[PDB]
Scaffold this active site. Structure first.
Site, PDB file in Angstrom:
ATOM      1  N   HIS A 130       0.877  -1.121  -0.167  1.00 36.03           N
ATOM      2  CA  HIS A 130       0.189  -0.020   0.173  1.00 36.03           C
ATOM      3  C   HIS A 130       0.803   1.508  -0.172  1.00 36.03           C
ATOM      4  O   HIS A 130       1.591   1.458   0.545  1.00 36.03           O
ATOM      5  CB  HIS A 130      -0.918  -0.084   1.135  1.00 36.03           C
ATOM      6  CG  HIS A 130      -2.105  -1.343   0.932  1.00 36.03           C
ATOM      7  ND1 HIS A 130      -2.609  -1.641   1.874  1.00 36.03           N
ATOM      8  CD2 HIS A 130      -2.443  -1.122  -0.021  1.00 36.03           C
ATOM      9  CE1 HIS A 130      -3.375  -2.605   2.044  1.00 36.03           C
ATOM     10  NE2 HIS A 130      -3.426  -2.663   0.562  1.00 36.03           N
ATOM     11  N   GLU A 184       1.573   2.563   3.272  1.00 34.12           N
ATOM     12  CA  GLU A 184       2.455   2.391   5.056  1.00 34.12           C
ATOM     13  C   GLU A 184       3.853   1.712   4.103  1.00 34.12           C
ATOM     14  O   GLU A 184       3.994   1.080   3.285  1.00 34.12           O
ATOM     15  CB  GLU A 184       1.540   1.094   3.946  1.00 34.12           C
ATOM     16  CG  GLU A 184      -0.222   0.879   4.908  1.00 34.12           C
ATOM     17  CD  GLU A 184      -0.748  -0.119   4.189  1.00 34.12           C
ATOM     18  OE1 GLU A 184      -0.415  -1.427   4.498  1.00 34.12           O
ATOM     19  OE2 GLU A 184      -1.896  -0.128   4.252  1.00 34.12           O
ATOM     20  N   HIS A 199       2.609  -3.699   6.148  1.00 36.41           N
ATOM     21  CA  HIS A 199       2.230  -3.083   6.435  1.00 36.41           C
ATOM     22  C   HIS A 199       1.589  -2.136   6.870  1.00 36.41           C
ATOM     23  O   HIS A 199       2.821  -1.758   7.859  1.00 36.41           O
ATOM     24  CB  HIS A 199       0.314  -3.678   6.026  1.00 36.41           C
ATOM     25  CG  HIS A 199       0.159  -4.690   4.792  1.00 36.41           C
ATOM     26  ND1 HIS A 199      -1.096  -4.010   3.516  1.00 36.41           N
ATOM     27  CD2 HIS A 199       0.128  -5.341   3.878  1.00 36.41           C
ATOM     28  CE1 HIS A 199      -0.611  -4.239   2.849  1.00 36.41           C
ATOM     29  NE2 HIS A 199      -0.070  -4.854   3.256  1.00 36.41           N
ATOM     30  N   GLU A 205       1.739  -5.965  10.406  1.00 34.93           N
ATOM     31  CA  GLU A 205       1.415  -4.306  10.190  1.00 34.93           C
ATOM     32  C   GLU A 205       2.640  -3.924  11.686  1.00 34.93           C
ATOM     33  O   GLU A 205       2.162  -4.308  12.448  1.00 34.93           O
ATOM     34  CB  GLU A 205       0.066  -4.401  11.200  1.00 34.93           C
ATOM     35  CG  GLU A 205      -1.105  -5.080  10.044  1.00 34.93           C
ATOM     36  CD  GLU A 205      -1.555  -4.801   9.023  1.00 34.93           C
ATOM     37  OE1 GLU A 205      -1.459  -3.011   8.903  1.00 34.93           O
ATOM     38  OE2 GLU A 205      -1.649  -5.126   7.639  1.00 34.93           O
TER      39      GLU A 205
END
Lengths: 365, 391, 335, 82, 475, 166, 203
Positions: A67, A70, A172, A265
């Protein structure tokens, strides 16, 4: 080191890391071009386009900045390349054996266009999340439950299909958690639904191995704005159990390939200011290395005559061009059946996996 | 003390009262300036005007407290100077000193409330086109006009312009003129590692062409890129006099006119050098071109005096506003009451349009309000082009 | 000039979003809407102006059934016709599209479908994109015994009778450089071909090319088309003192075009030739009123999907000779 | 004319509009208000009827921003001449 | 005249001063319901009913999108403090009556349709119950006329002595062939304007934050800027009927099916009925957008949403958060009294004020105030305008054409155009607020399809429920 | 007042939730366009607006005052009994003492069913006046017996430098 | 008996009129509703057409969030515009002010059920039976019937000043309200405490 390398910088930093190791170790290539023509740089690290595939070395990839906003993943992958090269020069024994026994692929930015459209200080509480064509890279892979608009996705798909990746993780932002595959569910409900795999426990182990070494993820509580105190037990979670994602890349990696992938993440601020990046490195470095080391678990070996399918768990894997196979497993007894079309099979049972290094077995069909 | 806006029919009468205190000359005289829009419009009134009108223009003003009604003095207004009426009525401002450049003009030679009537001026386009200039055709019907599509099998082939070959269709109009500007990224790391603010700036011979002719700030998905000196850059509250940080300033965005005007950082097009091709960076006026003017802003200038020259081409101020041959005269407690004729929009568009709205989410201080220490601040430059039209 | 027209049911009475992203390079990307409406176009000369009177009469609305294609008059069916005299719709006329009234009066022509384009980012719309429902207009309904009529008055447009934008030199006496070496303009990162560009053995795209009868839609040979002829610095904008002529109008070329409602324009004469009008003749939109088939006997909230296959004929009022095929041997200029 | 087109401002009062005055500190973005001292950088409303300097390329991190001299210039909005 | 159109297509919205006249024309198809028969219908104890299904269809334009386009709705809510209907003109024209046979469809010129209006309100008023069959939000959509049917007093699945049977053919009705048209004008009574605004002051914060009070409170101390929850106040929040709090984050709810068992309902005739949406109350407090009352809000359906068991992603919840300044939160108690005790359902008290439920572009417009001896704030709970004499029901039927009473009829339906033109009065927004207001705007960023527009398959969809309270006023 | 400045005033938890506020203190209205602060029984003009803690929301309004040119006075129950046991109401997650409350105690005067709303056929008197004279009925869709609970009459309409001089 | 006026029998008054009120000089009092509703407040909907509004109907597939449209079958779950009177009918079915059971709640039983607590993952939702309910917006009710033997008529503020009888600020010719109903089946008449609600109306 606190600087967001953009286009050109990326290639310069990756080649500086490549030169930061011994010659003949690193190869920087492009698996394709983004919509705006920005190359998708991939650095291959192993002792000895992408070059020949070394025997006895599983393929590990870490695709970050998938992304656009990110971007902790991008910088931590660049720093991972630099650290791997520096350790290989310095004689870091752990990194030496890692690079000797693993063919590590690093993809710092899968969506360079979105990264360029990203703005500094935007924690994501659009901001370049999609590619320049407006398509989400995480909502474009074939869902297990149009390629022309996403050249990055098609390039990644071709790169995956051309290889035999064993362990991988895409990194992420927006939270701090390790989510393992089947990121969606047949009912496609928003949240709550648990969607386990045939290797659900193995994915749990990989997510545990990454999370326990992360200073924030090990607590199991990201504790970040707009999270409602969404406490993830053990710092790990399932895909659909966290939230629905149709066409996730890790799901395609698991189903359409031998890849075992977990989404990481790293931080809940999507695009942190440059000053924090140093800290982010110390927040992730070991974990990243740990994840790579986790490729050496389960069963490994070769299939030779006196593309063979390995079966254990409704998830079969195929052998490589050398006949090598790597099935990620935890300690215990498993019944390994090897089946090759036109070669009458072999069911070698009582294969015992011990903790740590993967168990070895050679098959003669 | 009259300070309010009355909306009657297609007219809005905004009155505001405030408390007040190279070679050339600096006169002891102070001059009154109300050439910024926020001197007359509150942010609520500006929102009301821009959300419901396709255009507006001043009609007449009344100024009560000499004036150069014959414009015999160097008209210094319209150069975007300070000393304007503060946006906040409670603020007390000091009258700026009057000086001019060159011809000695002794101001006490002139004999020392009044009313001025604006000359008929075109409405300011308080709208952004919902259609692109190259997309005015029917996406279902082919063209009966053929275009050269093939040259080698060496041959000569012609095709009808259709929905698929849309860029090859014959067209009746061209984009506005271009005077190419250097591109600078707000993401600083994407820029060159050199101080090209002046050396690579787009200038006319060497005064800087700031902001130049009205051209789009960026094309699609490039909000970080802006022309080096082709946009209006306003100062955030308590910004530095010079060497201000990027976060200390607010860059206006003119991409609303990207559907008619060329992008400020990109070329106008390609011509034939001889089969060599040449790229046109600066394009003058051509027959059939259409272009939108620079957007006016709540903080931007309202008008500017057209120079009394023998000729001019589209005499609209390059900073935005209303080009007036006879602007409001220079005035050498103060109440200014200006009347604007609104252009009411009659749109049959089905989906809702884009309006200017304040962010709902929590903020430490209300935007376009006073902070803890009583300092009024304009957080962002409010544009005027929010409603949509067709070409 | 009176012609017999036929109008079918377009899009099955559906407004359809249409788009095209990236073959189909970024220069060809579009987003827009195809409407179930047809429109009347008489913008070609073979179909200065002072006024026009438009009539739409002798309307037959016929329903067609398949089993055996049986066509029967539907005497109680209507058609909706309206003119956007306020120019509130995207004016797709003046783009030199087909579907105009035939040059030969005896020809019976098909009414082109109405569609419009809107702001796009690839095949994907933006917030400023506008959607126009043509059913949201006051349209007169007409049965077989009704006729439609209006009158339009042209504004004061100058009578039909130098800046430079260099084109590429192409010889009719024969690499593929039609697009690469062509003269184009850049707009929003989309290179659009400057055809025919400003008014200036022909330039690459600086002329109007018409098609002879029975000509291929694409890759038509040179013998199958007719070129119009208007007989360092490469781009020269307007300077004080130059005078220039406009591109000539032709018997097959467009008559007018809509000057875009914009803050400024320079010599607003259409590049195709003709008359630049701030308020051109309003585009006349005509549609068959949807006639549903039998709905179920139990209520259903969903919109009706089964309609009677229907169409409507009528008459419309507003060398070089005919197997009965009428053809125009050459383009006729005015000068 | 007793005035020049680029001297129609106040030699005493600063402008409320900023212009990009600095780009390199490393890379940065500095903005300054047009003033009597930096009067050429100051914002204007009109252009003259080497006409000037335009940008030829799109500067990147490596491509230097080369410029181009406009020898012939056509009419532009907000352009005056005698 | 069979060959001449009865009327024309009028879809427009004229904004003249303080008046907005929205006219909308739609294409309708009416089939033969119940095979030209009045059929008695009847049916847990909570869901028992008795009534009659009639062969009549009725026209419904009680939804706001039937008249207001999304741009029209934006123009109405962004600039006006309030609005109310002033009048309506209803027209029914271009009527075709067709017969289908075994399969082909042929015009039946001599056939008629019966259309009348219950102008004396002698029929059971089924409008205002938020039923389907209204005019489509999109003018190009052709819609099916809903079948008329009414309920009556029941004892389980059986009628009682007071049960009323209504023969709609007993009413005087106009008969229309293909050349005839129907029309009537109705004038709305004096109705309070709907509050198209959200209060910029909370009820408990109406005092000067700089000056103490001269009234003491038992602490004894004077109310001041610091201790402001203790200051003397002139008004109370509106009445409360506590609702169950349900989190859109499904993991925060209990692992039980409490939708009916623990839902908020009212008991009537020994028959519990869900108090949906109940009295007007705030959906949630601030920073609590994920919580909504179990049945205290209007939940609209997205396009293609399932009739039963539609997931949260397929529906759109309406939030009454903008009335949190005056209305107590629906999911949370009204207050604490002495005995201490927690009051959950509070009736009306002197001095309390409360805002009505918001109206929505997809929501109802009006509802008939029941003809009762008394009523407290006779405003519909689903929102809209309470009318003693609402727009009359327009009943339409295909007159039977026969092929002991005659049973076999010619299988026949009808189509036509229906125009409803409502003139509404507006409240001009006159506020001295300095900062810009909150306006309804479409998303600026690129989107795969335009909101409130047709998709690639020709389907019109409303992406979100547009509220009505965007501008602000002071209490 | 405030040295001719509009000062933004506020109070958050970092007091308590019930006492949080946001508003403006002005240095100081026939159409009733300003926040009406009269009727609150106060001893400088300042007003409040919407808040979520010490910080405002987008719906909050800022008013610049320089931007400006009943029945004769003589039973429902809400049981009364200092703060923990006091009779208070709830509004937007903010317990506000119902002082003096409905006319009939810990906070019930000016210095089984316990809460009964309105019923058909029940009569009551309004609180006496001593004290405030009137109060503005909030402009709201519905109100029941719009009398001021504190007493009174419910009225529907009751060298140059750019820096600003200090 | 002259037109809408009667000068003073009870059977004739109750069998043919929807309401009546004294004239003399009585002040304008609302007509006493001499009719029993033929519709119940929870059954004002069309029993053939579903509602476009959704309601929460499903919470366990684990934990889920399911919405359904109100219909003829899920009739109690349909969204409604009004609420019953404050808690008034004597008794429910098969158990006198029963004529008002359509609008007024039963006197001997509760008004309804409200939510008591605030649910979470760990706390089951609780319900509170409301016995005494005051006035709420949008709630409607009937007044107590008058009787041939009952009374006729009977501060700073009052809510719905109705005794049974006529609420007079300042306490015989009676103005009648002729029934205009197109009810098909025969109405209920009084035939040989005599009530007053015999004719029927819709809500």
């Amino acid at each position: 080191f606190d600087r967001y390398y953009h286009e050109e910088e990326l290639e310069s930093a990756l080649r500086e890391a490549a030169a930061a190791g011994l010659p003949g170790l690193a190869r920087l290539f492009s698996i394709g071009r983004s919509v705006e023509g920005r190359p998708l740089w991939v650095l291959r690290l192993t002792a000895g386009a992408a070059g020949p595939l070394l025997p006895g070395r599983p393929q590990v990839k870490l695709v970050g900045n998938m992304h656009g906003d990110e971007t902790v993943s991008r910088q931590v992958l660049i720093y991972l390349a630099r650290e791997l090269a520096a350790g290989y020069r310095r004689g870091d024994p752990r990194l030496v054996r890692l690079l000797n026994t693993t063919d590590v692929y690093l993809l710092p930015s899968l969506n360079p266009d979105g990264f360029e459209r990203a703005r500094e200080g935007d924690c994501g509480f659009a901001s370049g999340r999609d590619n320049s064509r407006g398509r989400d890279l995480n909502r474009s892979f074939p869902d297990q439950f149009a390629l022309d608009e996403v050249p990055e996705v098609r390039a990644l798909i071709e790169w995956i299909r051309r290889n035999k990746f064993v362990l991988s993780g895409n990194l992420h932002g927006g939270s701090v958690v390790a989510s393992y595959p089947f990121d969606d569910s047949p009912e496609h409900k928003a949240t709550g639904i648990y969607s386990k795999t045939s290797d659900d426990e193995v994915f749990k182990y990989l997510a545990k191995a990454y999370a326990s070494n992360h200073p924030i993820m090990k607590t199991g509580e990201p504790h970040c704005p707009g999270d409602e105190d969404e406490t993830f037990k053990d710092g790990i979670t399932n895909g659909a159990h966290w939230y629905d994602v149709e066409g996730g890349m890790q799901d395609y990696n698991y189903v359409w390939a031998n890849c075992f992938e977990i989404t990481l993440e790293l931080s809940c601020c999507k695009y942190p200011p440059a000053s924090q990046l140093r800290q982010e490195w110390e927040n992730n470095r070991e974990s990243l290395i740990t994840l790579i080391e986790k490729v050496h678990i389960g069963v490994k070996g070769f299939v030779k005559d006196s593309n063979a399918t390995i079966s254990v768990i409704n998830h079969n894997i195929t052998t490589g061009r050398f006949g090598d196979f790597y099935r990620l497993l935890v300690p215990g007894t498993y019944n390994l059946t090897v089946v090759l079309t036109g070669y009458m099979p072999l069911t070698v049972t009582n294969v015992v996996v011990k903790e740590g290094p993967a168990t070895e077995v050679d098959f003669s069909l | 003390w009259h300070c309010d806006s009355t909306w009657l029919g297609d007219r809005v009468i905004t009155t505001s009262t405030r408390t007040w205190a190279y070679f050339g000359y600096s006169t002891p005289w102070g001059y009154f300036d109300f050439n910024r829009f926020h001197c007359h419009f509150s942010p609520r009134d500006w929102q009301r005007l821009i959300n419901n009108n396709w255009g507006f223009r001043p009609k007449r003003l009344s100024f009560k407290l000499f004036t150069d009604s014959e414009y015999q003095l160097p008209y210094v207004l319209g150069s975007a100077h300070q000393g304007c009426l503060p946006p906040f009525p409670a603020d007390v401002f000091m009258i700026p000193q009057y000086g001019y450049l060159t011809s000695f003009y002794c101001l006490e030679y002139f004999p020392s409330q009044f009313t001025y009537t604006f000359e008929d001026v075109p409405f300011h386009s308080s709208y952004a086109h919902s259609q692109s200039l190259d997309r005015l055709m029917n996406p279902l019907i082919d063209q009966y006009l053929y275009y050269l599509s093939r040259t080698q099998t060496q041959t000569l082939g012609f095709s009808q312009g259709g929905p698929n070959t849309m860029a090859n269709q014959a067209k009746n109009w061209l984009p506005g003129p271009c005077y190419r500007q250097q591109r600078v990224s707000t993401t600083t790391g994407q820029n060159n590692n050199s101080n090209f603010a002046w050396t690579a700036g787009t200038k006319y011979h060497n005064s800087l062409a700031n902001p130049g002719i009205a051209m789009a700030t960026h094309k699609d998905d490039e909000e970080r890129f802006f022309p080096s000196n082709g946009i209006l850059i306003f100062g955030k509250q308590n910004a530095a006099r010079d060497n201000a940080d990027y976060s200390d300033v607010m860059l206006t965005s003119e991409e609303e006119i990207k559907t008619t005007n060329p992008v400020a950082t990109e070329e106008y097009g390609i011509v034939a050098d001889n089969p060599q091709i040449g790229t046109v960076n600066s394009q003058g006026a051509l027959p059939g071109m259409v272009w939108q003017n620079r957007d006016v802003y709540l903080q931007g200038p309202i008008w500017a005096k057209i120079p009394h020259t023998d000729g001019n081409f589209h005499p609209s101020p390059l900073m935005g506003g209303f080009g007036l041959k006879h602007p409001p005269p220079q005035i050498l407690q103060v109440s200014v009451e200006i009347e604007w004729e609104l252009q009411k929009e009659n749109s049959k568009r089905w989906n809702p349009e884009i309006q200017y709205t304040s962010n709902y989410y929590k903020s430490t201080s209300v935007d376009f309000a006073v902070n803890t220490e009583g300092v009024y601040s304009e957080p962002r430059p409010i544009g005027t082009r929010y409603l949509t039209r067709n070409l």
